Amino acid sequence: XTPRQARAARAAXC
Ligand SMILES: *Cc1cccc(-c2cccc(C*)c2)c1
């Protein structure tokens, strides 16, 4: 994946 999940993952490095 969702818009949040994708950004959250990006912010973490996943
Ligand atoms: C595509 C996806 C599915 C589940 C969880 C995540 C995710 C979200 C935040 C951080 C990380 C490392 C992974 C992504």
Side-chain angles (χ1 to χ4, degrees), residues 1-2 4-14:
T2 63
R4 296 180 290 201
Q5 290 177 330
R7 296 172 288 164
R10 186 175 301 170
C14 338

